[PDB]
Amino acid sequence: YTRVVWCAVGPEEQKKCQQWSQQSGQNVTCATASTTDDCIVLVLKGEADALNLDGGYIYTAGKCGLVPVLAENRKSSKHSSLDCVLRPTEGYLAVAVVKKANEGLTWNSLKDKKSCHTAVDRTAGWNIPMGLIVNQTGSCAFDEFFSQSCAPGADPKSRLCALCAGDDQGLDKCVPNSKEKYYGYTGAFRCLAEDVGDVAFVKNDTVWENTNGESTADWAKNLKREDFRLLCLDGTRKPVTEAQSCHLAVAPNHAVVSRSDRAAHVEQVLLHQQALFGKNGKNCPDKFCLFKSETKNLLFNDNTECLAKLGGRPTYEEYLGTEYVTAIANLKKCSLEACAF
Ligand SMILES: *[C@@H]1O[C@H](CO)[C@@H](O[C@@H]2O[C@H](CO)[C@@H](O)[C@H](O)[C@H]2NC(C)=O)[C@H](O)[C@H]1NC(C)=O
Ligand SMILES: *[C@@H]1O[C@H](CO)[C@@H](O[C@@H]2O[C@H](CO)[C@@H](O)[C@H](O)[C@H]2NC(C)=O)[C@H](O)[C@H]1NC(C)=O
Ligand SMILES: CC1(C)Cc2c(-c3ccccc3)c(-c3ccc(Cl)cc3)c(CC(=O)O)n2C1
Ligand SMILES: *[C@@H]1O[C@H](CO)[C@@H](O)[C@H](O)[C@H]1NC(C)=O
Ligand SMILES: [Fe+3]
Ligand SMILES: [Zn+2]
Ligand SMILES: [Zn+2]
């Protein structure tokens, strides 16, 4: 009765989870909710066991008692002797991306421009840039900084949702799941690509993976890396090959979380499921690939090489790092340490 009930966020994740469930012979089954917060609630009620989360959502789950279990680990350079499951994670770079042709937009002229964010509460798309912005402006009024935005999860009538597009029928505008056209890393970068916004807060890998033919999706297939610049905190603009010297932060990798009392079982089941369906898996590309979903980053980021063991049985605070947790705490003061639910 180590069936693990995964929580899928929206219908496209639910469809992938259903295929995973079928292929796993119901070793894994699926609960679904409309939002990441709602999935965390199902886990707190014991109606789902686990899901994989961005760091800002790990902060929410962690305040309510849930614990990190395994982390996404993507390709690396050095440390290459180690098996992926054992290799330390390296964090990803949160960046602010603009079009080269939008000349003289820099970090210091962002006020009153249009912004694209992966979702409220997420690390690169929200906590890092809005925390930096609140700090730099000396003001908690971050909902009045950009003239319009798409920030999935904000009030859909507010200017923080004015750029969001909803689903193809145009329903579900601004919902924080993949139905919203501009949701997530891929959606916020598409929001910039399509010039709906002036700036997208995403990570370094997003720009690479959706330019120069790395994506064949209709909106991405013609994008050229050279037509984008990163915004540096010192006011300069750099090419996207320079993200090691022009990022807003290094983010902790997305990780699986669960109730502490289920962490051990969730871990062993996931280790076995990735041996089947993960990057070199017995049954991938054969039957099912757990870490593919045609660039849509459903359940896991498509660039995940494996889910890796954590060193030191970390608490969510240790996993996130004290400085990130403190930055989050500070930003949340704009809108005392109990579970949000
Ligand atoms: C930014 O992201 C890109 C995409 O993940 C990284 O480029 C990949 O890096 C490895 C080398 O580590 C190459 O083998 C891959 O083939 C690259 N992918 C692509 C699409 O080019 C890049 O290294 C990252 N930059 C920084 C500074 O972290
Ligand atoms: C925004 O500013 C706050 C206030 O300075 C930052 O909070 C401090 O962070 C440092 C470095 O971790 C700690 O030494 C201080 O104790 C923190 N101060 C407080 C009052 O808690 C926060 O890191 C900043 N946000 C961002 C995104 O950089
Ligand atoms: C295993 C972690 C989830 C803990 C952690 C810290 C961390 C933890 C404790 C105290 C400080 C940092 C930092 C990290 C790395 C670099 C910067 Cl500039 C900021 C944070 C990173 C990203 C990285 O791998 O380099 N991680 C990943
Ligand atoms: C299902 O779970 C059992 C128990 O670990 C295991 O023997 C079997 O290999 C698993 N099968 C699949 C298809 O995940
Ligand atoms: Fe993230
Ligand atoms: Zn840095
Ligand atoms: Zn510890």
Curated annotation (Swiss-Prot):
Poly-N-acetyllactosaminic carbohydrate moiety seems to be needed for TLR4 activation. Disulfide bonds join 7-39, 17-30, 64-339, 84-306, 116-191, 140-334, 150-164, 161-174, 232-246, 284-289. Hydrogencarbonate 2 binds at residues 118, 122, 124-125. Residues 4-333 form the Transferrin-like domain. Coiled coil: none annotated. It is found in: Secreted; Cytoplasmic granule. Fe(3+) 2 binds at residues 54, 92, 185, 254. Glycans are attached at residues 27, 135, 204. Monomer. Found in a complex with LTF, CLU, EPPIN and SEMG1. Found in a complex with MPO and LTF; interacts directly with CP, allows Fe(3+) incorporation into LTF and activation of CP ferroxidase activity. Belongs to the transferrin family. Transferrins are iron binding transport proteins which can bind two Fe(3+) ions in association with the binding of an anion, usually bicarbonate. Lactoferricin binds to the bacterial surface and is crucial for the bactericidal functions. Has some antiviral activity against papillomavirus infection. N-terminal region shows strong antifungal activity against C.albicans. Contains two BBXB heparin-binding consensus sequences that appear to form the predominate functional GAG-binding site. This is Lactotransferrin. It comes from Bos taurus.
